[PDB]
Scaffold this motif. Structure first.
Motif, PDB file in Angstrom:
ATOM      1  N   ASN B  41       0.823  -1.204   0.000  1.00 52.79           N
ATOM      2  CA  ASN B  41       0.000   0.000   0.000  1.00 52.79           C
ATOM      3  C   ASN B  41       0.858   1.255   0.000  1.00 52.79           C
ATOM      4  N   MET B  75      -4.911  -7.927  -5.705  1.00 53.28           N
ATOM      5  CA  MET B  75      -6.061  -7.036  -5.591  1.00 53.28           C
ATOM      6  C   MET B  75      -5.615  -5.587  -5.492  1.00 53.28           C
ATOM      7  N   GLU B  79      -6.733  -2.286  -7.852  1.00 59.78           N
ATOM      8  CA  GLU B  79      -7.451  -1.148  -7.292  1.00 59.78           C
ATOM      9  C   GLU B  79      -6.765   0.160  -7.660  1.00 59.78           C
ATOM     10  N   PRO B  82      -6.312   0.017 -12.438  1.00 61.09           N
ATOM     11  CA  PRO B  82      -7.223  -0.834 -13.216  1.00 61.09           C
ATOM     12  C   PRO B  82      -6.799  -1.011 -14.663  1.00 61.09           C
ATOM     13  N   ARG B 118     -12.742  -7.121 -13.939  1.00 58.96           N
ATOM     14  CA  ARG B 118     -12.116  -5.949 -14.534  1.00 58.96           C
ATOM     15  C   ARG B 118     -12.068  -6.032 -16.054  1.00 58.96           C
TER      16      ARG B 118
END
Ligand SMILES: CCCCCCCC/C=C\CCCCCCCC(=O)OC[C@H](COP(=O)(O)OCC[N+](C)(C)C)OC(=O)CCCCCCC/C=C\CCCCCCCC
Ligand SMILES: CCCCCCCC/C=C\CCCCCCCC(=O)OC[C@H](COP(=O)(O)OCC[N+](C)(C)C)OC(=O)CCCCCCC/C=C\CCCCCCCC
Ligand SMILES: CCCCCCCC/C=C\CCCCCCCC(=O)OC[C@H](COP(=O)(O)OCC[N+](C)(C)C)OC(=O)CCCCCCC/C=C\CCCCCCCC
Ligand SMILES: CCCCCCCC/C=C\CCCCCCCC(=O)OC[C@H](COP(=O)(O)OCC[N+](C)(C)C)OC(=O)CCCCCCC/C=C\CCCCCCCC
Ligand SMILES: CCCCCCCC/C=C\CCCCCCCC(=O)OC[C@H](COP(=O)(O)OCC[N+](C)(C)C)OC(=O)CCCCCCC/C=C\CCCCCCCC
Ligand SMILES: CCCCCCCC/C=C\CCCCCCCC(=O)OC[C@H](COP(=O)(O)OCC[N+](C)(C)C)OC(=O)CCCCCCC/C=C\CCCCCCCC
Ligand SMILES: CCCCCCCC/C=C\CCCCCCCC(=O)OC[C@H](COP(=O)(O)OCC[N+](C)(C)C)OC(=O)CCCCCCC/C=C\CCCCCCCC
Ligand SMILES: CCCCCCCC/C=C\CCCCCCCC(=O)OC[C@H](COP(=O)(O)OCC[N+](C)(C)C)OC(=O)CCCCCCC/C=C\CCCCCCCC
Ligand SMILES: CC(C)CCC[C@@H](C)[C@H]1CC[C@H]2[C@@H]3CC=C4C[C@@H](OC(=O)CCC(=O)O)CC[C@]4(C)[C@H]3CC[C@]12C
Ligand SMILES: CC(C)CCC[C@@H](C)[C@H]1CC[C@H]2[C@@H]3CC=C4C[C@@H](OC(=O)CCC(=O)O)CC[C@]4(C)[C@H]3CC[C@]12C
Ligand SMILES: CC(C)CCC[C@@H](C)[C@H]1CC[C@H]2[C@@H]3CC=C4C[C@@H](OC(=O)CCC(=O)O)CC[C@]4(C)[C@H]3CC[C@]12C
Ligand SMILES: CC(C)CCC[C@@H](C)[C@H]1CC[C@H]2[C@@H]3CC=C4C[C@@H](OC(=O)CCC(=O)O)CC[C@]4(C)[C@H]3CC[C@]12C
Ligand SMILES: Cc1cccc([C@H]2CC[C@@H](N3CCN(c4cccnc4)CC3)CC2)c1
Ligand SMILES: Cc1cccc([C@H]2CC[C@@H](N3CCN(c4cccnc4)CC3)CC2)c1
Ligand SMILES: [Ca+2]
Lengths: 607, 607
Positions: B41, B75, B79, B82, B118
């Motif tokens: 992150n 994931m 996010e 994309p 997606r």
């Protein structure tokens, strides 16, 4: 024409396809092939609907419903046509096969209750050519419904056929009853449960060869048919009603075998004669069964071997006095001055014609008149077997010996010229018949089998590719030494001798052509180095390695084929010798309250 | 240069190591290789963090997360990027491999739900050189995601790809659809469950060679590809939609095979021609399958054997009239007085040149003009096959025969001197072609196979160590008898003859040099006792014991390679012979409502 035996297999392949065509292009036969029962009620409630119309095999609509096991559709054809039950197929392939036959073969139906409720015939004969035994029909079930039911192992249907009056004694076109057909079925274990069930329903007060003593149309009972067909499983089960234990003593029982259909009773063909004179490999495993392997090795030790080493000592002594009357043959010196192609001739005797005026020619005259009488007696006990037992190796090699002795007799009387030719055959067709008597000895017994299995085996297929090589190189060797002096290295001087030199060079049983003083053709050294490799090195040792690969995968077959030679010899020695010699095998039971039969007991530990 | 074909395997080994270097020296590719989601992150919430940077193979960070199956780390890359889903690899080894390809190959993911959420492309083509079929890639999965999913046996992922719009008809660069690729997978049992699943999703109203009739880029359907690749398991399963049971009758069923892609329909290559003209050993076990072994032995018994024993009787009779026109060749006596090296010459004929004035030279003239015409017809039905079917043994041995007959014709016309040389080849290349016709006979059929497997087998590896010995001892024997009188024991008098004597002494096809009147060299008795042991005793019998060790471990292969010679002969006899002869195999179904196809029924017991 006649070469097409596959024009009947072609004629039934296009007959099964034409069956499936007639079902599709007719409305109720397709309605019976499927269930379609709401459509099958409609088709039969018409004015002139044909319920009695046929297919290509002559099926009615009840045949189609019973063949595709449609229970609900077959009820409808019997309600609106009760006459349809009694109707058989009429095609030549499936003659007489009623609808009761088809509902029985499927190993199940609730239709066989329904067909027999409509009093279907239990004595219908499926006499068509698709039900005969042949190596082109996968089944041989018989002709009758209980013959069809007993061969699919349906104990509920067999009992339900007999309760409606199925004849237990019905026979085929081959003469086989129900109990014969169970023996030559492929599932040998399930036929033992059925063999006991069909005998339980005999109970026949008119006994008269009760049910398993009645023969077919070649004189075989069910017990003898299991001997011929190789059925080992139905032979041990059939033998259970012939033995009976006298006593058991701890681990030690003493059975008593009946032996009345195994040993040669009279002029009837006994079961030891049927196993030898049949063409099955699996039939000769009944020679290892407990009443048979102890019957053969009881009349071979006692009576078969002394009467075979007496005939092997008379014959070996008959042929020493045939050899000595060919060693000492009359032979003058030559008179015609050899005005032949000189130096290519060395024959210098040209045997006598009526000169016997010698006391050594009279001793030979006795010794060469024994071998004439001894070769007539061969043609009086062998020719009345060939032309008295149909038309069908040591038979052939002893008529041929006895013929060559009579040819060299006629040449002796008329003073014919070339007499070395029948004697040269008779001295080697004669001595190689002493190999016949190498079967009374277990050591050198199977060694005579694996000479037959290699002459007409590994060497017969090597023969046709050796002769390809020794015609190619012998014709190459000939034309190389054709522009040559045959005075030195004359191995290949005319085309017969080039064939025989190259045959000898193939086997390396002559030296190998070389002169070393005169220059050979250049082409010879190449084409003999090729003949050395692909014929001596490659292909000769290919044949001694396919005789050494033969042994260890025939080592069991070749060693169990020795005591099949003992049975064939003991049978032959029993038929030829009179009843004054050769006492019968076993213990007769007249003086022991057992009947007129001849029994053979054996005791054994059973642990 | 060109000798290094391992310089591409070296170039991808150092390309996988450079991949693992670029992951370590970049912060988020190592953060995607591990989970490190609390550190992942942080790296993406920067100003100019490169989420679109590549590795050595052109991986994005989503490729690394999907390759090391990190669900939680992948994931995070979707996010905050994309757009990263749509991005393929760009290296030459792995071209076009999107992240959807990698998450599918691992036989599982919950990422394939997330990637398709997606809107990842299901029509992405992994066109890189690590996905082509080769003997340097361990996998051939295809190019498409459902080609990757069907080859890992993932029935949940295949259904989930098709529901998102995966094309069922997508083809490779090789032309293989999804159904071709399942056949040439190493796990043959799990491909039968997948072959049925991919056909269930066809249901294609535009049928037009529906799904298993569409060929690849060499004209093979899925059914024919299982024939070529040797897939026995996917051949029996593919055959289930071609048979259909006409009737079952108790233990006895009657199937009807379609036979429209097995038998030679027209100019298309039938499946019997593909098995013979392929280079796989396991492909010839489809010749033992139930519609094929009963098709071959039905057009060999009927039509293949009479048309092969007629060509084997014409050829064997053609070459007796070639032999006799070489036995009786024109051949005068000698004129040139033999003023040659006298006593080392014995050639004394030196054949004629234009002398045919004889009524026996005219009968030969007919018989040697048949063998000229008979050797032109060989070069008119064999040379238009070699130069019409690409460039790729008894082919070679019959062009060579037909060439040697035309060479000895030209030498006959121009009156050339040495004519014994082309005839000596043509008399043995000709007679050894009669071994070709020893394949119509099952006895002497495999005996011609294990001559080929020993000439180009056990004797070709013995050739190169025999020639070592017979050059060492022939050069030792020569210099021993060099200081010698060649008048007596002249086995080794010049160096060619010492080679040919020692070759003959190796095989023991000449005697063995001995004089016994004159003292030989002392060194000869030592070096011939060494040549007797290590060449005659040791090494010759080593070669006849490695031909006898060959048999019993090729005894199954050599005996199943006989009926592969029957197929190759029946195919050749069908292509050469016209359609006026040779009726087609099977029963046509125009007159039976089955279409325009040619069927072959067979019935069998199933117990
Ligand atoms: C395979 C078999 C090949 C051929 C064998 C011989 C041919 C068949 C037998 C001869 C036919 C004529 C015949 O029916 O033979 C009758 C004589 C019996 O009368 P006998 O007075 O000659 O013998 C008295 C000796 N006593 C008392 C001990 C029995 O049987 C004989 O001896 C003849 C048999 C003698 C040879 C036995 C084996 C050596
Ligand atoms: C005028 C001639 C009249 C008769 C002259 C006497 C010759 C023999 C005849 C009677 C004696 C035969 C006999 O009564 O016994 C047979 C004996 C073996 O007897 P055994 O029970 O001890 O065997 C061993 C038993 N075990 C294996 C269980 C341990 O056989 C033998 O040696 C005898 C061998 C003589 C036969 C030669 C046949 C030519 C064979 C050529 C082969 C190629
Ligand atoms: C089943 C019943 C059938 C057979 C029963 C017998 C039937 C009756 C008897 C038949 C015998 C006929 C044989 C025909 C040959 C005639 C022989 C002949 O006509 O002349 C006898 C020769 C004369 O000698 P020479 O002509 O060289 O003049 C010498 C010149 N001077 C005198 C100046 C030295 O006598 C010699 O040579 C000596 C001969 C040497 C070989 C004899 C030994 C036998 C060989 C093997 C026996 C093995 C037994 C089983 C194992
Ligand atoms: C069971 C498997 C084996 C099959 C048999 C294999 C061996 C073949 C049979 C041989 C038996 C020979 C019979 C002996 C007496 C008859 C002689 C003979 O044979 O005739 C001799 C003729 C002429 O010869 P000459 O030197 O006196 O004249 C030379 C003329 N000047 C001097 C002008 C050059 O020569 C000729 O035979 C010309 C004919 C040459 C071609 C013959 C081919 C053999 C026939 C069929 C082979 C089957 C193989 C199947 C695979
Ligand atoms: C491996 C094969 C090696 C080569 C085989 C021969 C070459 C291919 C065939 C010849 C090419 C020319 C051609 O197209 O051949 C046409 C003729 C048909 O016309 P036709 O009047 O001569 O036969 C009438 C006889 N009928 C009515 C019974 C059909 O086929 C023939 O007979 C020629 C074939 C005769 C030989 C059959 C096998 C022995
Ligand atoms: C001018 C020539 C024109 C024709 C002349 C007639 C010669 C042959 C042509 C027609 C006869 C062929 C035939 O119609 O039948 C083939 C026969 C075998 O017939 P099968 O059905 O009874 O086989 C047994 C079946 N089973 C195994 C299931 C029991 O084959 C045979 O013997 C025939 C053998 C003749 C071919 C020689 C080939 C040279 C071989 C060299 C080997 C190295
Ligand atoms: C598919 C169709 C292709 C072929 C169809 C046939 C085409 C038409 C016919 C062609 C024949 C070509 C043959 C070329 C050789 C010419 C022979 C020759 O030019 O002269 C014949 C010789 C003359 O004798 P001589 O020179 O020694 O003088 C003797 C001196 N005086 C008379 C004083 C005693 O006659 C002799 O020798 C007798 C010959 C002995 C060998 C003949 C037997 C054949 C051999 C095997 C047949 C087996 C069949 C298959 C198994
Ligand atoms: C497929 C496996 C097999 C490979 C082949 C094995 C056999 C070798 C080939 C042989 C073919 C021979 C051709 C016949 C005509 C050519 C003649 C020839 O051959 O020339 C002859 C020369 C001179 O001879 P002279 O007696 O007349 O003079 C003696 C002089 N005075 C009298 C002063 C002492 O001698 C010489 O060759 C001197 C050369 C000696 C060394 C030759 C070695 C062979 C070459 C390669 C071997 C490969 C083995 C691989 C493992
Ligand atoms: C004048 C005097 C010396 C009479 C001499 C005659 C005997 C030496 C001959 C006449 C009949 C012959 C027999 C005729 C029949 C046979 C059966 C024969 O066996 C077969 O038929 C072969 C079986 C097979 O292997 O298939 C073997 C020789 C043998 C015992 C013969 C042995 C020698 C015998 C007794
Ligand atoms: C595995 C076997 C069964 C196949 C190969 C057999 C041939 C290689 C043999 C068997 C008989 C042999 C033949 C027997 C008879 C003769 C006659 C013979 O002629 C003479 O002896 C002439 C002398 C005279 O007549 O005075 C020359 C050899 C020859 C052709 C032989 C050549 C080689 C043959 C054909
Ligand atoms: C397993 C095989 C394939 C390997 C070993 C093969 C050699 C041992 C053979 C094959 C051909 C043979 C050669 C064929 C031809 C000749 C020429 C020959 O010369 C002559 O005959 C001269 C007479 C003349 O020219 O008039 C002497 C033997 C020699 C060298 C031979 C020697 C032995 C050779 C090399
Ligand atoms: C003037 C008259 C007598 C004409 C005589 C000609 C025939 C004797 C020749 C001409 C063409 C030949 C055929 C040409 C082609 C072949 C295929 C050939 O087989 C192969 O190609 C080998 C297959 C393999 O083993 O790999 C074997 C011989 C055969 C049947 C030949 C058999 C003999 C034929 C019919
Ligand atoms: C059953 C089989 C299959 C494949 C191959 C064969 C061999 C049979 C003949 C053989 N030639 C035979 C004779 N030649 C020869 C003759 C004369 C001078 N110099 C050479 C050498 C080789 C070559 C191949 C056999
Ligand atoms: C493949 C291999 C491995 C190990 C060993 C060998 C043998 C090959 C040559 C052999 N000599 C060859 C010739 N000699 C010789 C020659 C002349 C006079 N007296 C003696 C004797 C022995 C000795 C060893 C082969
Ligand atoms: Ca010798």
């Amino acid at each position: 024409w006649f070469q097409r035996r596959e024009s009947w297999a072609q004629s039934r392949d296009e007959q099964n396809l034409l069956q499936q065509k007639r079902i599709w292009e007719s409305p109720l036969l397709l309605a019976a092939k499927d269930n379609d029962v709401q459509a099958l009620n409609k088709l039969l409630k018409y004015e002139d609907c044909k319920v009695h119309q046929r297919g290509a095999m002559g099926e009615t609509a009840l045949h189609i419903a019973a063949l595709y096991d449609n229970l609900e559709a077959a009820m409808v054809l019997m309600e609106a046509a009760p006459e349809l039950v009694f109707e058989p197929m009429t095609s030549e392939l499936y003659e007489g096969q009623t609808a009761l036959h088809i509902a029985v073969v499927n190993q199940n139906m609730n239709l066989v209750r329904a067909l027999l409720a409509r009093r279907a015939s239990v004595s219908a004969r499926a006499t068509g050519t698709a039900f005969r035994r042949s190596p082109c029909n996968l089944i041989y079930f018989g002709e009758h419904p209980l013959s069809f039911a007993a061969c699919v192992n349906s104990e509920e249907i067999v009992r339900l056929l007999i309760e409606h009056g199925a004849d237990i004694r019905a026979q085929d076109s081959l003469g086989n009853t129900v109990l014969h057909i169970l023996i030559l079925q492929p599932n040998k274990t399930f036929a033992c449960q059925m063999y006991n069930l069909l005998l339980s329903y005999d109970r026949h007060g008119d006994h008269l060869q009760p049910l398993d003593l009645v023969p077919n149309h070649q004189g075989l009972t069910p017990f003898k048919l299991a001997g011929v067909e190789g059925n080992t499983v139905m032979f041990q089960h059939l033998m259970q009603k012939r033995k009976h234990t006298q006593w058991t003593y701890g681990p030690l029982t003493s059975t008593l075998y009946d032996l009345t259909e195994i040993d040669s009773s009279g002029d009837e063909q006994s079961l030891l004669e049927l196993i030898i004179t049949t063409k099955k490999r699996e039939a000769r495993q009944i020679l290892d069964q407990t009443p048979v392997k102890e019957l053969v090795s009881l009349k071979w030790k006692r009576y078969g071997r002394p009467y075979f080493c007496m005939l092997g000592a008379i014959y070996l002594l008959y042929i020493i006095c045939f050899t000595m009357c060919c060693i000492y043959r009359p032979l003058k010196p030559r008179t015609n001055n050899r005005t032949s192609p000189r130096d290519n001739t060395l024959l210098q005797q040209k045997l006598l014609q009526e000169a016997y005026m010698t006391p050594k020619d009279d001793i030979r005259l006795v010794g060469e008149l024994v071998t004439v009488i001894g070769a007539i007696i061969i043609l009086l006990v062998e020719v009345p077997d060939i032309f008295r037992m149909g038309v069908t190796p040591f038979h052939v090699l002893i008529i041929t010996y006895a013929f060559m002795v009579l040819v060299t007799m006629v040449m002796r009387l008329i003073s014919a010229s070339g007499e070395v030719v029948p004697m040269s055959f008779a001295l080697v067709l004669g001595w190689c018949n002493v190999m016949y008597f190498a079967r009374g000895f277990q050591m050198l017994g199977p060694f005579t089998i694996m000479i037959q299995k290699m002459i007409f085996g590994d060497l017969m297929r090597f023969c046709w590719l050796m002769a390809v090589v020794i015609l190619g190189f012998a014709s190459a060797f000939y034309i190389i030494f054709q522009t040559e002096d045959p005075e030195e290295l004359g191995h290949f001087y005319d085309y017969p001798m080039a064939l025989f030199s190259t045959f000898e060079l193939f086997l390396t049983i002559i030296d190998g052509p070389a002169n070393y003083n005169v220059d050979l053709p250049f082409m010879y050294s190449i084409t003999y180095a090729a003949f050395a490799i692909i014929a001596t090195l490659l292909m000769l040792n290919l044949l001694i390695a396919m005789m050494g690969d033969t042994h260890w995968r025939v080592a069991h077959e070749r060693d169990e084929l020795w005591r099949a030679q003992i049975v064939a010899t003991t049978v032959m020695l029993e038929r030829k010798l009179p009843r004054c010699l050769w006492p019968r095998s076993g213990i007769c039971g007249r003086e022991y309250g057992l009947g007129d039969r001849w029994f053979l007991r054996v005791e054994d530990r059973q642990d």
